[PDB]
Amino acid sequence: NSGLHIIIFDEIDAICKQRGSMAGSTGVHDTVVNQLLSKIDGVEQLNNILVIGMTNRPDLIDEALLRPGRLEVKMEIGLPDEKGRLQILHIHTARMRGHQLLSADV
């Protein structure tokens, strides 16, 4: 009956990377991944969390961290098209049109 707990990681490819690829870290960069993996989905059961990650280099992240059950929904946020631009330009000039600060020519 518990509520939801949300954790928002950021630049998730700064700590998580393919294991064994990096060298000279003194080991601190190869046990963090193990701890995170064991904690997201371990022998005990958790059913009230939600983890969000965002990054600019999708393919560097560890492969064992992306199978279904840990980070299922993968999405790409690409550039817009003409309709997308007409929409985006129509959100940022809403206030100006409200108080008649925007001329009738534009």
Binding site: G24, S25, T26, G27, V28
Partner: protein, 40 residues
Amino acid sequence: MAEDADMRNELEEMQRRADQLADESLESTRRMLQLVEESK
């Protein structure tokens, strides 16, 4: 040749030795001695 990039370091501390309680014990004991001398 191949010049090593450099290096990075890790740390592992150790317990400290305050050894400050013994001073309070010694002060208390000296007070013991003073009172004991006066009582006689």
